[PDB]
């Protein structure tokens, strides 16, 4: 898994894994490449 700068991959105990970005301020269930 490539980790891009500004992104945090955070898995909550409910089984909620959201990829969030502080750069553009966006979150997605998909794995970001860039």
């Amino acid at each position: 898994p490539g980790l891009p700068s500004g992104w945090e991959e955070r898995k909550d105990a409910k089984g909620r894994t959201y990829y969030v970005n502080h750069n553009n301020r966006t979150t997605t269930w998909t794995r970001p490449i860039g």
Binding site: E8, R10, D12, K14, R16, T17, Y18, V20, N21, H22, R25, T26, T27, T28, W29
Partner: peptide
């Protein structure tokens, strides 16, 4: 994941 679209991101993540 087929999950409903992630919670609106402002500054910090909240779920």
């Amino acid at each position: 994941e087929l999950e409903s679209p992630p919670p609106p991101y402002s500054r910090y993540p909240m779920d």
